[PDB]
């Protein structure tokens, strides 16, 4: 079973929170991190590597050689964080993954559930961590239902977001 954590935040606080997450990683943790834009993924990778948290970024135009080196490094432990945009590389052994980290909230709820499934498919326990901001407040109610269905704790800030969204929508009919 997979522990699901939702962190309500703003776009300016995402970098600092993600910094705090990666600094608190155990030496055994291996993270697949989801970022919507390639240049942000590159920025994050070079930040992490400069600090000594070994990482690589991949996107849809990454060469097959680059992807297969990243997958081998993820297996061997030569990287601890694989930051991906638009794809998950096919040769990735999901048994090595302890965490899914959604730096950007995915484009819909079905993609979110699929990413939780990346750890749940192996039958091992693991953790999904997701950052959500006001731009994705239309997802908040659906996300609460996912958490309630999976018997996961519901953060107060997520309930506040879903209530605020509903009130703002009711004023617009």
Nearest partner of 103 among 1, 9, 4, judged by Cα: 9
Please name the residue that has the structure tokens 């992807």. Answer: 67
Q: Name the token pair of 112.
A: 């979110």
**Which residues lie below 8 Å from residue 130, measured CB to CB, with a gap of 6+?**
4, 5, 6, 7, 101, 102, 105, 112
Give the resolution value in Å: 2.0
Q: ∠ CA(67), CA(115), CA(113), 5° rounding?
A: 160
**Which residues lie below 8 Å from residue 171, measured CB to CB, with a gap of 6+?**
none
DSSP letter, residue 97: -
CB atoms within 10 A of CB 118: 18
Nearest partner of 162 among 113, 109, 103, judged by Cα: 109
* Strand blocks (E) in the chain: 2-8, 31-34, 55-58, 81-84, 99-102, 126-132
Task: Give Cα 141 distance to the centre of its chain.
Answer: 19
d(CA 126, CA 133): 24
Q: ∠ CA(135), CA(157), CA(5), 5° rounding?
A: 90
**Could you tell me the strand order of the sheet in which 55-58 lies?**
2-8, 126-132, 99-102, 31-34, 81-84, 55-58
Domain map (residue ranges) of the chain: 2-171
**Which residues lie below 8 Å from residue 5, measured CB to CB, with a gap of 6+?**
127, 128, 129, 130
d(CA 147, CA 93): 26
CATH code of 2-171, in short, is 3.40.50.300
In this structure, are residues 73 and 3 in contact, taking their beta carbons and an 8 Å threshold? no
CB atoms within 10 A of CB 155: 16
**Which residues lie below 8 Å from residue 103, measured CB to CB, with a gap of 6+?**
14, 18, 33, 34, 35, 40, 44, 131
Nearest partner of 58 among 76, 75, 47, 44, judged by Cα: 44
Please name the residue that has the structure tokens 């694989």. Answer: 82
Instruction: Write down the experimental method used for this entry.
Output: X-ray
| Helix/strand/coil for 103 | coil
Which whole-number Å values give the CA distances from 2 to 51, 58, 91, 121, in the listed order? 29, 25, 22, 10
- Cα dihedral 57, 22, 151, 2, rounded to 10, equals 50
């Amino acid at each position: 079973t997979v522990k699901q954590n939702i962190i309500v935040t703003t776009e300016k606080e995402k970098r600092a929170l993600t910094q705090e997450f990666v600094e608190n990683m155990s030496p055994n943790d291996k993270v697949i991190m989801f970022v919507s834009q390639k240049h942000i993924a590159d920025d994050l990778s070079s930040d992490f590597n400069i600090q000594g948290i070994s990482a690589e970024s991949l996107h849809g135009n990454s060469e097959q050689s680059d992807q297969e080196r990243a997958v081998e490094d993820f297996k061997s432990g030569n990287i601890k964080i694989l930051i991906t945009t638009d794809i998950v590389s096919r040769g990735l052994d999901l048994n090595d993954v302890t965490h899914v980290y959604n730096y950007d909230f995915p484009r819909n709820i079905d993609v979110y559930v699929h990413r939780v499934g990346y750890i749940g498919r192996t039958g091992k326990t693991g953790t999904s961590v997701t950052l959500i901001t006001q731009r994705d407040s239309k997802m908040a109610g659906e996300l609460i239902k996912i958490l309630d269905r999976a018997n996961q704790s519901v953060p107060e800030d997520l309930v506040v977001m879903a209530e605020q969204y509903k009130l703002n929508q009711q004023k617009r009919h």
